[PDB]
Structure formats: structure tokens, C-alpha cells
Amino acid sequence: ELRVGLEESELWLRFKELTNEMIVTKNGRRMFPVLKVNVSGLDPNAMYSFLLDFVAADNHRWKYVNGEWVPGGKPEPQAPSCVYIHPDSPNFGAHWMKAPVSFSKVKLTNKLNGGGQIMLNSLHKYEPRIHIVRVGGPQRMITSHCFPETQFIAVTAYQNEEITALKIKYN
Numbered sequence: 001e002l003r004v005g006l007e008e009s010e011l012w013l014r015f016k017e018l019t020n021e022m023i024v025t026k027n028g029r030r031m032f033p034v035l036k037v038n039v040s041g042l043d044p045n046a047m048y049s050f051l052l053d054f055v056a057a058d059n060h061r062w063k064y065v066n067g068e069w070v071p072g073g074k075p076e077p078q079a080p081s082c083v084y085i086h087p088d089s090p091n092f093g094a095h096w097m098k099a100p101v102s103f104s105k106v107k108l109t110n111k112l113n114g115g116g117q118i119m120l121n122s123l124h125k126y127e128p129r130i131h132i133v134r135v136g137g138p139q140r141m142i143t144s145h146c147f148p149e150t151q152f153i154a155v156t157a158y159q160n161e162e163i164t165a166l167k168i169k170y171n
């Protein structure tokens with residue numbers, strides 16, 4: 001059975017309980033914390049690519065109002081984010097299972113850009129999600145996993161200084 005787990009969930013939970021925020025820039029900003037995933041139950045010899053995308057957790061614009069995040073009242077449908085391919089892709093099960101799969105090179109942007117960078121809507125709430133795609137083999141297969149622990153609001157600058165402080169404390 002394919003098992004997918006979150007490395008350093010303790011740290012993600014500190015950020016989540018304060019409402020996590022991730023900086024987006026026109027050029028694209030790397031994430032802190034980094035999404036790291038423990039994976040077991042892959043065929044060491046089978047071929048897989050690791051994909052990352054960001055689900056709009058709700059259809060609302062959020063705003064920091066008197067030290068608290070509150071949603072607008074005018075939802076719009078949220079077009080899904082683009083997919084980031086882990087640069088080790090494609091690779092053997094053994095490669096993916098020898099150490100946590102670490103998405104340290106994904107960059108979050110607010111502007112449609114060349115490639116690499118994933119465009120998010122500023123002040124929308126996102127839930128990171130991976131797809132483990134079995135490639136090359138006869139039978140293509142996809143397994144998807146969500147990480148509620150790693151939810152955040154995309155911001156152009158931090159609103160909650162509690163978040164600013166946690167980021168610096170642990171980077």
C-alpha cells in the first residue's frame with residue numbers, strides 16, 4: 001500500500017494554528033516551510049514523477065482586518081493552479097523513498113510568467129497537493145494526496161507578525 005506522510009508536521013502545525021501566509025512576487029518566491037513528503041510502498045524499480053499543485057481551499061478573497069483574517073462575501077470560481085514537476089522527475093521508486101521528497105525549488109508568483117513559477121491569486125487560501133504519476137510502465141497510475149497542515153493565504157507581504165517571527169525563528 002502506497003503511504004504518503006508530511007515531514008516536520010509539528011512545524012507546519014505551529015504555522016497553521018496562526019493562519020499560514022506565503023509570499024508571492026512577480027519573479028516568484030520559494031516557500032518556507034518547504035513541503036517535504038515521506039513516501040513508502042512504491043515499487044523501487046518502477047518509474048514515477050512527483051507533481052505539486054495548489055487547490056483554492058475556498059472561493060473567497062481574504063483580508064487581514066483588526067489583526068484577523070476574514071473572507072469577503074463575493075466568492076468567484078477558482079481556476080485550478082498550474083502543476084510543478086519535482087526536478088528529480090522522472091525517477092525510480094528507490095530514489096523517492098531514500099529521503100523526503102523536498103519541493104524547495106518551487107516559486108510562488110502573482111503574475112503569469114515564462115515557466116517554473118506557479119501563479120497563485122493573492123489573498124486566496126491554498127491547500128498544497130501532490131500527484132505521484134507512475135510513468136514509462138504499461139499501466140499509467142496517479143495517486144493524489146492533500147496536506148491540510150500546509151494550508152496558507154498567498155500574500156504580497158506578511159500581515160500577521162506572529163508569522164514573520166516564526167518564519168525567521170525557523171529558517
Ligand SMILES: C[C@H](N)c1ccc(NC(=O)C2CC2)cc1
Nearest residue numbers: 049085086087088089090133135
Ligand atoms: C525535464 C523535467 N525534469 C520533466 C519534464 C516533464 C516531465 N513529465 C512527466 O513526468 C509527466 C508524466 C508526468 C517530467 C520531468
